Ligand binder design. Structure first.
Ligand SMILES: COc1ccc(Cl)cc1S(=O)(=O)N1CCc2c(C)cc(C(=O)Nc3ccc(C(=O)O)cc3)cc21
Ligand SMILES: CCCCCCCCCCCCCCCC(=O)O
Length: 625
């Protein structure tokens, strides 16, 4: 059949009973905020911020908090952070390219000949449509985080739980230490795009649409991947239609329209309206509502750096950046999902990513020897045409110049630390995540002699309409430990170093579990600020404090996701003087892909990460510095 999974428990079985996202006590939030400030602020800055915190907790903050709580109790179908967080993304006027959109790259099909571009484009496309089908049918297994997978990820439990009504089903999983996740974001995975508009962009979805969008050399093509009955178009036909597209000899347009999706959101909002005025509404409608955008790149990957630039931004011509996601397949079969971040988070895209990799490699629709269906692709595949006025041509030329100049300034490079990873660190009773984050802190001290604002993404999808919370890895413990390794390495015995590292690990694990439970401080303080602005009030002084602005100017911006399906991932710095650090600690090695602009040096940082990781492993192995 056209399904890649056959869950007996409906996909959405736990959604109705998901716990609401907790609002912390204000007292806990201000304490956590100041705790994160401790490594960043000098004595007088800290005392000044401590004083604003007290004012806030006693004054306008207490009143904003009372109102946050009452609003939440009137909207128990949702989360307090959901509206504010969507608004954070959609009101942002900066380019979504680099600023917001990340990538994750698939590992190759382990069967060598399946990495042929046509074979893999077809297999990955068909598997993505099978994911859409399985989601529609409620046949995708619910997302569930198991503490004891051997007790709860069992047919035995699944047979039982399916009889528990959705109003109670979450409780049945909770009682076996399983935690069902929110899955409401999957409503925007397919047939969805972001539409640029003044003030605040729009999330658009059209579930009726049955066609794929393909970009090749900056030309736009659409064809159906679902027939009128609701079945997947025969994969041999899809193969034919893709072969047709791959055969187009037309040069890259003089005015590649995909450049516009990289503009400032107000600029693009106005140019899109001009596109409509010039009669393009039908064309844009087909782009907007396609199942997703398949991007066929006309070159192989030179190396990991090239791959990373290719999947993060490409050259500006062959990605529709607004789309829920772009599935990119290069000439050597290298594939990635580049996604728009406003509609959903890492956990939702990763499940799609994992199922698509598993299906496309284990149950490929076609083989490198399949004969495309005898079909008249020119009748089935429409080549889209945009009517561009002079103002549109000029806007595309400007979009291109701005794209080219900015991307020019972006560097990305990687390390593969091979001495060990998760196995060895867990043996030493440490959180691998904490160790990576320590290494980043220690690296930055070694390189710049500073402790700086640090961001780690944490899913709050254990709750109804959850998104993310910020883990704040820069702690007094990481700062002390880094100082010991970097500044006075002869002052401490290996036992002392190992203990310092143990205290980093514990506090990091504590922050991680708090964040996952909604007990960070970042989202809470953000929702209070949002509430004050939405009520038409002056910004409270807490938020005007340089230290608050510093806490949210994330020089070290980090994110990890791990899966056997992901070769690597990337994102650009979130600030001009920042790094963007995609990392994974695997069973036996550690990988970091780091981006930077002109204001930072990613190569040096990575040399420092390498050195710090060597120093950390040496101390852990008993060896002296
Ligand atoms: C909690 O750990 C995990 C649990 C389940 C999985 Cl499938 C993967 C992981 S993980 O290996 O990818 N991982 C290691 C520790 C960790 C932590 C502390 C946080 C996250 C996480 O939430 N990451 C994340 C990344 C990006 C986003 C995003 O939306 O951008 C959101 C969350 C993953 C991981
Ligand atoms: C939504 C966030 C996505 C970005 C996070 C992806 C992190 C996993 C990959 C780490 C890059 C490691 C590079 C080593 C080279 C292989």
């Amino acid at each position: 059949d056209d399904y890649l999974q056959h869950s007996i428990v409906p996909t959405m079985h736990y959604q109705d009973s998901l716990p609401r996202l907790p609002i912390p006590k204000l007292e806990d939030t201000m304490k956590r905020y100041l705790n994160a400030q401790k490594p960043l602020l000098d004595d007088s800055q800290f005392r000044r911020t401590e004083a604003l915190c007290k004012n806030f907790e006693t004054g306008v903050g207490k009143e904003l908090h009372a109102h946050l709580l009452a609003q939440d109790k009137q909207n128990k179908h949702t989360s307090y952070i959901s509206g504010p967080w969507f608004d954070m993304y959609l009101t942002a006027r900066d380019s979504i390219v680099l600023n917001f959109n990340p990538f994750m790259a698939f590992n190759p099909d382990p069967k060598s000949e399946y990495n042929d571009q046509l074979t893999r484009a077809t297999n990955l496309t068909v598997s993505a449509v099978r994911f859409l089908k399985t989601l529609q049918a409620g046949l995708l297994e619910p997302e569930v985080f198991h503490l004891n997978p051997s007790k709860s990820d069992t047919d035995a439990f699944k047979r039982l739980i399916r009889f528990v009504p959705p109003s109670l089903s979450w409780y049945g999983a909770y009682l076996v230490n399983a935690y069902p996740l929110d899955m409401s974001q999957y409503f925007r995975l397919f047939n969805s795009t972001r539409i640029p508009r003044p003030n605040r962009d729009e999330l658009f979805t059209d579930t009726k649409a049955r066609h794929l969008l393909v970009l090749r050399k900056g030309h736009f093509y659409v064809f159906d991947v679902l027939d009128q009955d609701g079945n997947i178009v025969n994969p041999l036909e899809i193969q034919a239609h893709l072969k047709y597209i791959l055969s187009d000899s037309s040069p890259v347009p003089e005015f590649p329209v995909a450049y516009l999706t990289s503009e400032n959101r107000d600029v693009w909002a106005e140019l899109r309206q001009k596109l409509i005025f010039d009669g393009n509404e039908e064309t844009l409608k087909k782009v907007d509502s396609a199942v997703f955008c398949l991007c066929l790149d006309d070159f192989p990957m030179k190396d990991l750096i090239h791959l990373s630039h290719t999947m993060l931004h490409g050259d500006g011509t062959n990605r529709w950046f607004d789309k829920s996601f772009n599935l990119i397949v290069a000439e050597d079969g290298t594939a990635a999902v580049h996604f728009e971040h406003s509609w959903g988070d890492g956990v939702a895209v990763l499940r799609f990513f994992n199922e698509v990799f598993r299906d496309s490699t284990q149950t490929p629709a076609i083989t490198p020897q399949s004969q495309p269906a005898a079909t008249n692709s020119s009748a089935s595949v429409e080549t889209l045409s945009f009517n561009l006025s002079g103002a549109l041509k000029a806007g595309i030329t400007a979009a291109k110049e701005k794209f080219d100049t900015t991307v020019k300034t972006l560097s990305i490079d990687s390390i593969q630390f091979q001495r060990g990873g998760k196995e060895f660190l867990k043996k030493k009773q440490l959180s691998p995540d904490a160790v990576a984050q320590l290494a980043f802190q220690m690296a930055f001290l070694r390189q710049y002699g500073q402790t700086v604002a640090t961001y780690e993404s944490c899913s709050t999808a254990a709750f109804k309409h959850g998104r993310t919370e910020t883990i704040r890895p820069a702690s007094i413990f990481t700062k002390r430990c880094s100082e010991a390794f970097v500044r006075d390495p002869s002052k401490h015995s290996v036992g002392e170093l190992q203990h310092m590292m143990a205290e980093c690990s514990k506090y990091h694990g504590q922050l991680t579990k708090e964040a996952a439970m909604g007990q960070g401080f970042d989202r809470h303080l953000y929702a209070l600020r949002y509430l004050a602005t939405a009520r038409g009030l002056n910004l409270p002084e807490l938020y005007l404090d340089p230290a608050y602005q510093q806490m949210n100017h994330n020089i070290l911006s980090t994110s990890t996701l791990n899966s056997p399906a992901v070769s690597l991932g990337g994102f650009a710095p979130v600030v001009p003087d920042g790094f963007g650090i995609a990392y994974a600690v695997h069973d036996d090695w550690i990988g970091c892909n780091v981006s930077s602009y002109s204001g930072r040096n990613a190569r040096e940082f990575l040399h420092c990460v390498q050195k710090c990781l060597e120093d950390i492993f040496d101390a852990l192995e008993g060896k002296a510095i």
